[PDB]
């Protein structure tokens, strides 16, 4: 989200625009600061996915592992589990040449203006392309013997070597028997059914979408309507007096409204920097837990880790770490 | 509009059907009114003002600006649009529609390279103007074989070496 | 240093208003009628003042204006202005008359001085003068054969011509500013504050570069609201006809510019930040150069059209039903808090007379009131002379 | 700075058999120089760039069944059964390129 | 120093040569003046305390 100040403050009224002129340095530092924030975030997205794919898919064929029923197949473009955690998450956004007009037929990133949400650098089919080639490289790259100069091995044998590794049950158990396969598929089945509501991670996901949607729309609803001493969106708009004191109440509303906008910009720098920390963590979770196994505890959550899958969640990745549980 | 004791700027529509109907506004949890009443007697529900959330695609190397609109519209805009207030402000200066509307030719034009200056959803927009490339991804996909054998993509050349990242360690004190 | 700065500037791409002065009519031997544009009747609003591009075409080849088929080398000519606080029409009805004290900026001496003076302009009454018969426009002139001879320029030539159309009365000042003769492009500017009227020129401080600097503050404290361009015509003979460089007037307004100052302090580049989003972005960064990317510039908000006002409908009912009483039993309808279509009511009847006091019939339909009283009765048209305020 | 200490103790002393952090490729060397306010790394990574798709197994067997595969990289190609794997190709008869695990399915070679 | 309508505390030096030279200060992008003018007629560029 980028705010278009000098027309957020003010609503577009010429006297209030001149009183912004007086503050023509601060607005430049606002939009300068947010454009810097988006380039840092965008380089986190770009550097993240350039540290995602690199090499080399299987490719995506409807049979991954025999017989491991994988929901992570693309049906055809945003696979099925990714469809579950995009349908169950409540987003009132976005508009890209159908949602602006679709809201015009009736969130308001395109109506206050004001604030304005930029698109996330990548179309959904293409983030789906990164993580789908990543699902292709799960089997062969999870072998390893080096990251990344390999391979094309079927997914079943990838989980008998990933399972041979740290759940160090050697070959006689996985030979006699499998089904494991039905226990693996049973595990992924309960991983299909359970998203809502008592299954955070998922409440963390809606804590994120409700976080940035809350900050954006709800903080921008606190910023406007109302803040100031007399604050009917222009202090003494046209309809009430004075003309002399109009600049006084309006300058209250601009100092306050722009100051709280500058608090929003400081907040975007905070969650941008922490988002880049967590994105570097995600790159550390893809290069360790997703390619390799990774012979380490949680991070690769709760048990001797076996497989892990990546799907694009709202604003973030999302992992489906398949761990062992002795019992 | 300009109603009884209330000012405002809205787009009235004949909507349905939520209100009090005896006193004659309806708010939505804030100071705003969303928005019918007053007309006699229907439901002219109002909305906020229309704003075109414009931008600029400079490109200082070839000095070629290219004005992009946010998310609307290939159909609703007009060139040097006379229904709207601020270019900004004095003077202004239509192809989409993957993201929004742009005042810059041309249609895709695939696919390169990808790099900056890297506009929104996926117009990758090189220069020279000449927007909208979609340059992804593309990994060298080894194909999966069927039987006891399984293909693998080993390389041939070393080609070492990069400079890499700064890690900041301190402040100035 | 470079910087963003908020001050009075013309806007990028403004074509401004162009003015041209011409040789007058002439035979081979004798100057005749002056030849001018309609500038004197075109009174402009001063607003924040203006800047003027002078002499830009000097050196190039152009037409003589009064004889379009004749070309000549273009020479710089200086503009003249009339400015003031109150305007109207001359006795014969033509526009362009300035009332009370008027500021006149009038070059003279074949372009070797500027005169600035503040006087009442009394229109003179001889033939072709502004209070006389056969008036078309006032103007100034000089006669180069006698006014611009080497070593003996007539300083007052234009002033004298002006004095033929107006008597100058109660002048509070008359200042002169010398000008060195050349064909170099220059800029002139004028603004006003409570301190008076400020004159700007590139000539003294940046002759070769064009930046304008203040060279005078005139004690004119009555706010200037209006100006016109005083037409000049050059009383040459046919064989002496020259082409005179058009000049261009551009209005000033408060704008924020990027200003690029050279090492020597002068401004050789600027950006009009509000011109478009690209320039906007260019200004952000407090630099001429803005790094290549996407930069968000603000809306584009739609224009108000169809301003709905809600408050209804005034009840003229009992007037139409029954017998209008006699004048001495007049019935009274009172109106508080309602909307009226009165031209509606007066479209039912045939209306024979409509007079108002302290209002007009046009006005009484339009305005809003806190109270409207309608009294009606039977009354014969024969007795109109008795129904009077 | 604690990250930099984690990058010096992992990527600079040891190798570190892990992906980026030690940026972009199977990491080889890394060098440290003092930058303004921080350190600065010159991570020397591998970059493969000429990929040739060849064929596995997965190992070998015979009439008797002890296996091979792998020390540590795959296969066991064909022509005839050769083993320069990651990165370049291809070795001789193995003789030290082979642990001997249990047999698996797709019998005798040995998948 | 204490110049015309401006106060301040500075170390004047005969510096070169940047200014306007017709009106008599020079600022550097802020309220401060860096700083020559006024002397008659040279370049006494000032500094902070
Ligand atoms: C999401 C999905 O398709 N799940 C299927 C399930 O319906 C089916 O019962 C099972 C047996 O083959 O395979 C898997
Ligand atoms: C359900 C509803 O709102 N229907 C409305 C109707 O009442 C109205 O008469 C018509 C004319 O605009 O538009 C539609
Ligand atoms: C046509 C055919 O024989 N396809 C087989 C398939 O049935 C088997 O599941 C797969 C795994 O080895 O190998 C191949
Ligand atoms: C046969 C072969 O792979 N030759 C490569 C060549 O293509 C590449 O240009 C060069 C630069 O790294 O390295 C070597
Ligand atoms: C002859 C003439 O123009 N007189 C005007 C007068 O009409 C005007 O009321 C007054 C106030 O500005 O200025 C003078
Ligand atoms: C004291 C006196 O008579 N002053 C008059 C003045 O009122 C008039 O406006 C002016 C213009 O002719 O002439 C003089
Ligand atoms: C041009 C010249 O030789 N002398 C004039 C002089 O007559 C005049 O008094 C002075 C003030 O404008 O300007 C100079
Ligand atoms: C400097 C000088 O003496 N005269 C200049 C000349 O250089 C230029 O060509 C022309 C302006 O367009 O006239 C003037
Ligand atoms: C730090 C900086 O920008 N210095 C510039 C310098 O490079 C340039 O040569 C000089 C001439 O205009 O102006 C100043
Ligand atoms: C290039 C420069 O600044 N030179 C100055 C000179 O002008 C001045 O006369 C001298 C005396 O202080 O100091 C030195």
Residue numbers in the entry:
A (entry chain C): 802 to 877, 886 to 915, 924 to 1144
B (entry chain B): 606 to 698, 710 to 744, 757 to 801
C (entry chain B): 67 to 377, 381 to 458
D (entry chain B): 1096 to 1206
E (entry chain A): 606 to 654
Question: Could you give the paper's own sentences about this structure?
Answer:
The key determinant of host specificity is the envelope-located trimeric spike (S) glycoprotein, which can be further cleaved by host proteases into an N-terminal S1 subunit and a membrane-bound C-terminal S2 region. In the S1 subunit, the receptor binding domain (RBD, also called the C terminal domain, CTD) is localized in the C-terminal region, spanning ∼200 amino acids, and structural studies have revealed that the RBD consists of two subdomains: the core and external subdomains. For both MERS-CoV and SARS-CoV S proteins, the S2 subunit is mainly composed of α-helices and forms the stem region of the S protein. Here we present high-resolution structures of the trimeric MERS-CoV and SARS-CoV S proteins in its pre-fusion conformation by single particle cryo-electron microscopy (cryo-EM).
The cleaved form of the MERS-CoV S ectodomain was confirmed by SDS–polyacrylamide gel electrophoresis (SDS–PAGE), and further N-terminal sequencing revealed that the S ectodomain protein was cleaved after residue R748, three residues ahead of the S2 cleavage site. For MERS-CoV S trimer, two classes were found with one or two of the three S1 RBDs in the S trimer in the ‘standing' state. Aside from the RBD, the rest of the S1/S2 protein remained the same as in the trimer. An atomic model of the cleaved MERS-CoV S1/S2 trimer was built de novo using the 3.7 Å map, except for the flexible regions of S1 CTD and part of S1 NTD, which were fitted by crystal structures. The final model includes residues 18–1,206, with several small breaks due to the poor densities. The MERS-CoV S ectodomain is a 140 Å long trimer with a triangular cross-section varying in diameter from 50 Å, at the membrane proximal base, to 140 × 130 Å at the membrane distal head, resembling a blooming flower. In the cryo-EM reconstruction, we observed the density for 10 N-linked glycans in MERS-CoV S protein and 14 N-linked glycans in SARS-CoV S protein.
